[PDB]
Design a protein around this ligand. Structure first.
Ligand SMILES: [Cl-]
Ligand SMILES: [Cl-]
Ligand SMILES: [Cl-]
Ligand SMILES: [Cl-]
Ligand SMILES: [Cl-]
Ligand SMILES: [Cl-]
Ligand SMILES: [K+]
Ligand SMILES: [Mg+2]
Ligand SMILES: [Mg+2]
Ligand SMILES: [Mg+2]
Ligand SMILES: [Mg+2]
Ligand SMILES: [Mg+2]
Ligand SMILES: [Mg+2]
Ligand SMILES: [Mg+2]
Ligand SMILES: [Mg+2]
Ligand SMILES: [Mg+2]
Ligand SMILES: [Mg+2]
Ligand SMILES: [Mg+2]
Ligand SMILES: [Mg+2]
Ligand SMILES: [Mg+2]
Ligand SMILES: [Mg+2]
Ligand SMILES: [Mg+2]
Ligand SMILES: [Mg+2]
Ligand SMILES: [Mg+2]
Ligand SMILES: [Mg+2]
Ligand SMILES: [Mg+2]
Ligand SMILES: [Mg+2]
Ligand SMILES: [Mg+2]
Ligand SMILES: [Mg+2]
Ligand SMILES: [Mg+2]
Ligand SMILES: [Mg+2]
Ligand SMILES: [Mg+2]
Ligand SMILES: [Mg+2]
Ligand SMILES: [Mg+2]
Ligand SMILES: [Mg+2]
Ligand SMILES: [Mg+2]
Ligand code: NA
Ligand code: NA
Ligand code: NA
Ligand code: NA
Ligand code: NA
Ligand code: NA
Ligand code: NA
Ligand code: NA
Ligand code: NA
Ligand code: NA
Ligand code: NA
Ligand code: NA
Ligand code: NA
Ligand code: NA
Ligand code: NA
Ligand code: NA
Ligand code: NA
Ligand code: NA
Ligand code: NA
Ligand code: NA
Ligand code: NA
Ligand code: NA
Ligand code: NA
Ligand code: NA
Lengths: 160, 154, 92, 186, 95
RNA sequence: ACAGCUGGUUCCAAUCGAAACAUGUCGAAGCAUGACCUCCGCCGAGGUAGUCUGUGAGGUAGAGCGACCGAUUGGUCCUGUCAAACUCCAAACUUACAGACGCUGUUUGACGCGGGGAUUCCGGUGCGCGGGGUAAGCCUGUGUACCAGGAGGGGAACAACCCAGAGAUAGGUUAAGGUCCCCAAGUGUGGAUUAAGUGUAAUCCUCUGAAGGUG
RNA sequence: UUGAGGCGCCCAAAAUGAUCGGGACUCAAAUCCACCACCGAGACCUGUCCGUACCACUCAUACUGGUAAUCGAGUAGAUUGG
RNA sequence: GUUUGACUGGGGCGGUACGCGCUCGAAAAGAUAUCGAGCGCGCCCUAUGGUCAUCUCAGCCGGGGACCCGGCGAAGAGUGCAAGAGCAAAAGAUGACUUGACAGUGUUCUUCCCAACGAGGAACGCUGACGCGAAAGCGUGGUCUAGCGAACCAAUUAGCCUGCUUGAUGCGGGCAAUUGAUGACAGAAAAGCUACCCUAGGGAUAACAGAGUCGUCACUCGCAAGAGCACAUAUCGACCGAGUGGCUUGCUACCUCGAUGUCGGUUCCCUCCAUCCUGCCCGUGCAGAAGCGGGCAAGGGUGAGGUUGUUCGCCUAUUA
RNA sequence: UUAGGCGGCCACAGCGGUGGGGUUGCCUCCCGUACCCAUCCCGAACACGGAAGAUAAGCCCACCAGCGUUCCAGGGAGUACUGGAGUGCGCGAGCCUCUGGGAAAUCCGGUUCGCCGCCACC
């Protein structure tokens, strides 16, 4: 199913699990990556991937983008490189599909998506000055898998 | 005291806004009225803000418009110094204008129509799709700004 | 539900509270001499008999209470509004 | 106390002094309240009316100001209670008060208790108050006979200070008689 | 509405803020009003009896006599004149 | 024959001027009763479409949840997220009443009362707020203005987009929009960008153009 | 070396004859910032007249005079003169 | 001889949004639709009703998942049943007493906002008689919002009125009210087929074509995991993301029901390019030959047969 | 108000903590069961009778802010949202300008350890 079907925020918030059953599990494997035993403050460089447009990102997209980003960090810094990446959003919004025609149209439950407002941090990675260009590359690959245009922003980091 | 001129027509305008203009004695486009600066009147002009031009005119400008467009409660009669003198509590147009500006009286109290039926703006106005700060003619005006309009609608 | 066979309550006849006895209204037998009985015979003929060709309706899931409240001293009964009750058993 | 959602009782409920459910029912009569209250040593009676900023006491009597009329006995007993009610009732009559409802606060409606004695006193003073005769103590006990018969089992004076040995319910009569008298400085 | 009972859509208006929870003070339940007095109608969530139809919350009527301990307040619902039976517990003096 | 269904129903003008909704209905292609339109008689001084202020009503937006509730991360307090059927909070705004100003009414009688006569109960579109739906020149609400029943000016044409509400005739000045020609008015002025004929396309079924990329 | 902004370029495939209404336009007849002067409705102003409502006079709803900035569009329909 | 209902993204099947209650939808007054989301009611209770007295609950802790003692504990317990709301010297618990779950008659709100409309419901009175309490006071059933039913007829309750000249008896007719059902729930007594069909109409509403949409379908692009002996990018290419087309399918119900003649085929004309061949090119896992992939490009060509009505597709021999 | 009674507002009053105060005065704790009355068992409580003792509880007075609450300044913020208008921008979801309104979290510093009414009373 194309994202065109779910990317917009044209529907009421639909997250109350006490009134919604049969919700598919999330495909997102992890939210905390790298060295989760270490603190973010232990790093000189902090780069975030910022969403430029308000949208809904299906859990399948979060996984694909997160995967393609962390997979790169692993390939360039090693399975235990000195870095830590975070996917701060969780797919709370439940999605439907009307899969009879328009009669009794209320859709059956098909998935979940995360609502992200423009200007927000979807991903935030923490690394050393050396690995700064590696995290910028992970993010480049990550924004190619989500609907909106993004900004790769260096927050804590002035070895520039 | 501010001068109110309707620059946008009744078609498609909210009924509560249209009724506000009617309470302010304006029933046609280019019709002007003088309104005291009170809390009650302030709310009324703010509501009408988008279909009108308003602001405090200068003594001179008011005198020009009063002389040229003022009318009695009933009839054609020109409102000149003599008329003002023989029917009002003042000696001439200047005295009336000053009183109006200082909010001591009203056109009605002096036996005059509350409405100054202006002429279209000579040279045209700045447009009814944008406010003054955007180059248009709608909303609050400068004293110089109001004067320009009132004089062009002489 | 359960209900006392006898209990103190208002007697509209004596005009004062007294012990009443509650009994379920037993159906009185028909005489077959009422006007409607004569109309049935009179108006029934060849073909359909209009209203007289109709048959007894159905049943509501639960019926209302149909009782007689007898004054224990003057012996005169009175009727009251019934209330829906699946079953009604008297205590004693 | 615990947070924003926490519910703190009304002040007089925390203090455990006012029964608000009983108070409402009392106020429904539209009549003034005959507030009967006790203390370990004294008995107080007040005729209270409703007010915009709080209750208004139009008349009252305390068992202490009983001596002002010739009382030499203790002030936390039956005779004391009746007389304090009568005194309050008499002062109530003077203030234009004709009727009242008995408010006993957090006290118990025990038959023959002191609050009913206060009630009987006020009624005898001239106040019309909804009551029940068989809940009031029999006349002799109000006089203080139960205490005299108690001192009869002497061997040691009931009263520490010297008011008298065998006590006097006759003193009760003298005081009542003094109050029922028209003159009396209220 | 999915139903048409008196309490439909009254979740907000008939619920107390957690701190105003519990038995209300008797003072306002015994208040006395005179014929002609303007009173604001507002159901007190804590007081069960003496209420009016929730649709009238917020109305400001005129006391025009009483029935028993309750008051008879005159209001105008839209364009229609109505008489509302209500106790002091749900009434407040205007101004 | 009957039909709640289709068709048709013939002169002029002046005043007012809808409803396409609610309740009931073997009712949904129909009726009745209300709403709303109109006419007549009565009453006799107030009325309230606007704003301001005062006294009240309210939990939508937003926000937040070591404030309930239920969702929702990780680490050896900290750290990561949410709610149409959550709320410690909380608008704009809507609304009851009153006063004030405004406007209106007392020969144009308002407000209101009583009675006669209807038409109407297929609606539509724009904007704002919506609920459903991948979406629709979709379905179904809501507030408002418009079309319907609204001319004339503009928009190439074009029910509802812009100006504009209009007796006749006449002169004049503007509005929207426009001033190179077609075509009334500038091949106007100061300055800058663009080399793609990008563009010369407010709005839109209608005018596309996206993620991504560009020494 | 790096950050930001403006315009454009690539991404960009459809059926009878291409299009911004057309012609055609490039220091513009495009775009953005300003500004100047004009054209252009039945709107607005103004002369005369008509209708309708109201006022004065009147038997008149016959004349005469006066008022309308706050009268003049209209399907179904109600009312009225011809 | 008749009936065989209505609702409905046409109708039928399914369902009941056909009578009711709650939260949300509902846009912070009121009102508000859909075959909208969550889910309930057609009872049950003599106490699970009423009053009074005494009393305070969940849960946790400490001392001897039963019991006993103490402490913390505004409410998360309990209160018949949905949901939301209310309640702590109580509306909850225990105990005791009691029958107001009473008769009669109203005022008002609701049903039906505004704004007419019945049954039903509720609030608040009065008259009468009672219960409990010291008393104020409480009790018009259950803390509040669902738990309901016309006329005709019958049975039932107490008294009274009345039946054709008149008296007696019988048996009737009536005033007030209770009970008996119509759930299609403001109430008919009610099954189907028609391709043998017929009429009135409707594009108010379906099939076909058109139109809108584009989920489906076709094609493309971005990113490039992966494999391709090593090598992402000769070639193949997942996930995810962005699109174009209007050939399929589905949706919608705008257009036509006083008719725009169906599928497939045929014949004859024009066109599109996302190119199968042919021309000119680039790369190659390009020695050559034969290929594979890509670019420009629509001038021309793209044929004959076997099964099947087939479109499509399978198969044969030819073919650039 | 040198300690009381009835209240209104119902946390600005709650939670927690420190200090001070009572010879025939006040409130209490306190002492005690013949009586009125009382415990499904207990004079514990309720009720009645009373002063040998005490200020340790409670209570009243003075005060502390750590928690909870109320309000105020500055910051967040004229941000978020929003009533009215636009041939303003954007493929579009959406945004911007003008006009009239205007939060919440949180941070920081203050405030708040009740206020008021009637009666009685060295
Ligand atoms: Cl029965
Ligand atoms: Cl006491
Ligand atoms: Cl009501
Ligand atoms: Cl018009
Ligand atoms: Cl060109
Ligand atoms: Cl004529
Ligand atoms: K057809
Ligand atoms: Mg005039
Ligand atoms: Mg000009
Ligand atoms: Mg212009
Ligand atoms: Mg027969
Ligand atoms: Mg005609
Ligand atoms: Mg005419
Ligand atoms: Mg709400
Ligand atoms: Mg929100
Ligand atoms: Mg609203
Ligand atoms: Mg029409
Ligand atoms: Mg020219
Ligand atoms: Mg072009
Ligand atoms: Mg556009
Ligand atoms: Mg007309
Ligand atoms: Mg027949
Ligand atoms: Mg048949
Ligand atoms: Mg049907
Ligand atoms: Mg509402
Ligand atoms: Mg009840
Ligand atoms: Mg029948
Ligand atoms: Mg029966
Ligand atoms: Mg029905
Ligand atoms: Mg109904
Ligand atoms: Mg036919
Ligand atoms: Mg159609
Ligand atoms: Mg043909
Ligand atoms: Mg090509
Ligand atoms: Mg060709
Ligand atoms: Mg001490
Ligand atoms: Na179906
Ligand atoms: Na993207
Ligand atoms: Na016969
Ligand atoms: Na309360
Ligand atoms: Na027929
Ligand atoms: Na309709
Ligand atoms: Na209908
Ligand atoms: Na019909
Ligand atoms: Na006025
Ligand atoms: Na919003
Ligand atoms: Na119109
Ligand atoms: Na045109
Ligand atoms: Na071009
Ligand atoms: Na007409
Ligand atoms: Na039927
Ligand atoms: Na009724
Ligand atoms: Na299609
Ligand atoms: Na498409
Ligand atoms: Na035709
Ligand atoms: Na064919
Ligand atoms: Na070709
Ligand atoms: Na074949
Ligand atoms: Na036992
Ligand atoms: Na002490």
């Amino acid at each position: 199913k194309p994202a065109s079907m779910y990317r917009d925020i044209d529907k009421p918030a639909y997250t109350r699990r006490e009134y919604i059953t049969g919700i598919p599990g999330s495909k997102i494997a992890q939210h905390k990556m790298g060295r989760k035993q270490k603190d973010a403050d232990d790093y000189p460089v902090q780069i975030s991937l910022i969403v430029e447009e308000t949208v809904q990102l299906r859990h399948g997209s979060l996984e694909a983008s997160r995967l393609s980003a962390n997979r790169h960090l692993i390939k360039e810094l090693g399975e235990e490189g000195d870095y830590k990446m975070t996917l701060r959003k969780f797919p709370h919004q439940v999605l439907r599909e009307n899969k009879d025609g328009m009669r009794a149209a209320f859709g059956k439950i098909v998935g979940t998506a995360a609502r992200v407002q423009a200007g927000e941090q979807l991903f935030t990675a923490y690394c050393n000055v050396e690995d700064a260009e590696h995290v910028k590359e992970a993010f480049r690959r990550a924004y190619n898998k989500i609907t909106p245009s993004c900004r790769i922003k260096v927050e804590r980091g002035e070895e520039l | 005291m501010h001068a109110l001129v309707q620059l946008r027509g009744e078609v498609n305008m909210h009924t509560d806004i249209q009724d506000t203009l009617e309470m302010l004695n304006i029933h046609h486009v280019n019709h002007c009225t003088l309104v005291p600066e009170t809390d009650a009147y302030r709310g009324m002009v703010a509501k009408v803000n988008d279909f009108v031009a308003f602001g405090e005119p200068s003594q001179e400008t008011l005198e020009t418009v009063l002389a040229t467009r003022a009318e009695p409660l009933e009839g054609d009669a020109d409102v000149d110094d003599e008329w003002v003198a023989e029917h009002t509590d003042y000696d001439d147009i200047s005295g009336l204008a000053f009183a109006l500006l200082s909010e001591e009286t009203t056109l009605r109290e002096q036996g005059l129509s509350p409405t100054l039926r202006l002429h279209p703006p000579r040279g045209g106005h700045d447009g009814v799709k944008h406010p003054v700060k955007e180059g248009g003619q709608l909303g609050k005006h400068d004293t110089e700004g109001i004067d320009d309009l009132l004089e062009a609608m002489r | 539900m359960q209900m006392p066979r006898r209990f103190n309550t208002y007697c509209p006849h004596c005009n004062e509270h007294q012990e009443h006895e509650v009994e379920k209204v037993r159906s009185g037998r028909q005489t077959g001499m009422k006007w409607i009985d004569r109309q049935r015979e009179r108006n029934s003929g060849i073909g359909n008999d209009g209203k007289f060709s109709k048959v007894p309706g159905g049943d509501k899931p639960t019926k209302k209470t149909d009782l007689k409240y007898r004054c224990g001293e003057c012996g005169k009964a009175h009727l009251r509004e019934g209330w829906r009750a699946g079953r009604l058993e008297f205590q004693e | 106390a615990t947070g924003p959602r926490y519910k703190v009782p009304m002040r007089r409920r925390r203090e455990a002094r006012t029964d608000y459910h009983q108070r409402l029912r009392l106020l429904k009569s539209g009549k003034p309240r005959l507030v009967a209250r006790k203390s370990n040593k004294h008995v107080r009676a007040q005729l209270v009316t409703l007010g915009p900023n709080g209750d208004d006491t139009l008349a009252s009597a305390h068992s202490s100001d009983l001596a002002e009329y010739g009382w030499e006995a203790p002030t936390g007993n039956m005779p004391s209670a009746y007389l304090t009610g009568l005194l309050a009732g008499l002062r109530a009559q003077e203030a234009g008060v004709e009727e009242a409802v008995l408010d006993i606060g957090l006290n118990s409606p025990t038959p023959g208790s002191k609050v009913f004695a206060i009630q009987e006193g006020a009624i005898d003073a001239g106040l019309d108050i909804p009551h029940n005769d068989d809940v009031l103590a029999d006349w002799q006990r109000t006089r203080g006979a139960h205490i005299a018969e108690y001192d009869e089992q002497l061997e040691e004076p009931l009263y520490s200070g010297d008011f008298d040995a065998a006590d006097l319910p006759e003193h009760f009569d003298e005081l009542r008689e003094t109050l029922l008298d028209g003159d009396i400085e209220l | 509405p999915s139903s048409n009972g008196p309490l439909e859509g009254t979740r907000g208006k008939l619920k107390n803020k957690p701190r105003d929870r519990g038995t209300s003070p008797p003072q306002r339940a015994v208040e006395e009003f005179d014929d002609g007095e303007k009173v604001h109608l507002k159901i007190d969530p804590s007081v069960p009896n003496g209420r009016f139809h929730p649709r009238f919350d917020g109305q400001t009527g005129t006391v025009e006599g009483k029935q028993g301990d309750a008051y008879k307040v005159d209001i105008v619902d839209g364009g229609k004149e109505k008489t509302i039976i209500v106790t002091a517990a749900h009434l407040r003096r205007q101004e």
